[PDB]
Design an enzyme around this catalytic site. Structure first.
Site, short mmCIF file in Angstrom:
data_model
loop_
_atom_site.label_atom_id
_atom_site.label_comp_id
_atom_site.label_asym_id
_atom_site.label_seq_id
_atom_site.Cartn_x
_atom_site.Cartn_y
_atom_site.Cartn_z
N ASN B 8 0.86 -1.18 0.00
CA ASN B 8 0.00 0.00 0.00
C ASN B 8 0.89 1.23 0.00
O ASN B 8 1.51 1.55 1.02
CB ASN B 8 -0.93 -0.01 1.21
N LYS B 10 0.07 4.26 -0.11
CA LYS B 10 -0.61 5.37 0.58
C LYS B 10 -0.42 6.64 -0.26
O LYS B 10 -0.34 6.57 -1.50
CB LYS B 10 -0.14 5.49 2.03
N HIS B 92 -9.67 0.68 4.81
CA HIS B 92 -8.41 0.92 5.50
C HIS B 92 -8.63 1.82 6.72
O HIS B 92 -9.48 2.71 6.71
CB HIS B 92 -7.40 1.57 4.54
N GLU B 94 -7.13 4.27 7.91
CA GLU B 94 -7.05 5.70 7.66
C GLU B 94 -8.36 6.22 7.08
O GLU B 94 -8.79 7.34 7.41
CB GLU B 94 -5.85 6.00 6.75
N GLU B 165 -5.89 -5.05 10.66
CA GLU B 165 -5.01 -3.95 11.05
C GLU B 165 -5.07 -3.76 12.56
O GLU B 165 -6.13 -3.39 13.07
CB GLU B 165 -5.41 -2.65 10.35
N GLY B 171 0.87 3.92 16.00
CA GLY B 171 1.14 5.22 16.61
C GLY B 171 0.70 5.40 18.04
O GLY B 171 0.37 6.53 18.44
N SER B 211 2.68 -3.44 11.61
CA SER B 211 4.04 -3.13 11.20
C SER B 211 4.69 -4.38 10.64
O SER B 211 4.88 -5.36 11.38
CB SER B 211 4.86 -2.58 12.37
#
Lengths: 248, 248
Positions: B8, B10, B92, B94, B165, B171, B211
């Site tokens: 991906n 992004k 996704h 995001e 995910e 983060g 990750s």
């Protein structure tokens, strides 16, 4: 102020139909004093830009607010410049009200696009319940203030065209008159005069983004504070050329 | 189940950097038993698909839920097919958590993409407060049920790859072990077995979207219910090739 006509293709496009529209534009006889823009879906931005004379602007229908990063599904102004496009539509009513973009996000995107060399059609407008509450100006001014607060330099207004969308007339059975459009455009221009400067107010283009057709384009264009159009469905049809010539 | 590695990109890409990644992929020595996919920004989809051998899948990072219409800034599965692309990433984290896409919207998009001949990487996963409150399965199963309810037939799962995910590890300073990944993948596969069918559960690929690095990819790949990866930042680097070879 130079008359400005943008065609928003929205989510319509294919190699075959795009080629038909490009040939229509290529052979069209258009007033040379009118600025003309088309906005295809993002997949087709590089090819439409390659195939269309620079006389026509080619715009993205949206972009994001940083040059790169972890934003799956988003494209940046730097990418637009990389494929030769220097315009974007931001804050369209479909993006604000269906896809949930906030006033602040639209302002952040506008500042960032212009900083990267991309000019912006910044869209504003009120819904029916807002208009019925007497809040047309309150809503439009709040949307404009979110753009103003986020700009980083006074010159960025030279790279903005404001589009007023009467969202209250979309799928409500209400229709906007040219007199109603002129009244909002004049109010927005006076906001620019008071909050930015008289010099910017006299030079910024405020284009009408309601229903624009071959039948109504001349009566809208003659309004003193209507400087052009952001056209929807008619941008996919030969009628677009007549609309480009509405001021002549 | 065939090992499946998607990269991906992004919101990263340019003509020059895309060419470098395409040259890397074209000349790389990759396990022939691995299915490999890349997902560039939408502007670059037609060009990347033209330049990359059909051995590689090329995917959009998002799409909408009808073939055409008044959805400024959106692209449809028909447009993807028109430029030779037959994959899309949907849901996704995001797009769900920054751009505010709902469970139902993801399910509607997934059904429509598959109906139009586009395969889907469908992304699910829980945030840190949800995991700490014990809601890992509740959240993942809710996201899966919104897809299941919107599909037209169970056979459409044959055109889906599920990506888990661990948003709680994105983060936050929390990190996922291969045991935690295997635990969720097993729970999702057992949901498929109970809510869809054992035949689909045994054949659907469930790929890990946390990750993924050159250093950790082999230990993740050996987990019995981890069938590959949806790779982020490493997809822009030569490390991507090592990750593609994690099962060999």
């Amino acid at each position: 102020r130079k008359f400005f006509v943008g065609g928003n293709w929205k989510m319509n496009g294919s190699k075959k139909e795009n080629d038909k529209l490009i040939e229509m534009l290529t052979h069209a006889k258009i007033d040379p004093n009118t600025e003309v823009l088309v906005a295809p879906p993002a997949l087709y931005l590089p090819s439409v830009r390659e195939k269309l004379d620079k006389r026509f602007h080619v715009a993205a229908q949206n972009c994001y607010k940083v040059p790169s990063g972890a934003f799956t599904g988003e494209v940046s102004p730097a990418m637009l410049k990389d494929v030769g496009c220097d315009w974007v539509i931001l804050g369209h009513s479909e993006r604000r009200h269906i896809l949930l973009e906030t006033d602040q996000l639209v302002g952040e995107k506008t500042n960032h696009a212009i900083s990267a060399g991309v000019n912006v059609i910044a869209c504003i407008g009120e819904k029916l319940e807002e208009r019925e509450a007497g809040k047309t100006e309150e809503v439009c001014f709040r949307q404009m203030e979110a753009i103003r607060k986020n700009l980083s330099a006074a010159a960025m207004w030279n790279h903005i065209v404001i589009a007023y969308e009467p969202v209250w007339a979309i799928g409500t059975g209400k229709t906007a008159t040219e007199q109603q459009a002129q009244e909002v455009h004049l109010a927005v221009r006076r906001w620019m005069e008071e909050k930015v400067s008289p010099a910017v107010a006299k030079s910024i283009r405020i284009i009408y983004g309601g229903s624009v057709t071959a039948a109504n384009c001349r009566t809208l264009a003659k309004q003193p504070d209507v400087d052009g159009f952001l056209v929807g469905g008619a941008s996919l049809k030969p009628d677009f050329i007549e609309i480009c010539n509405a001021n002549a």
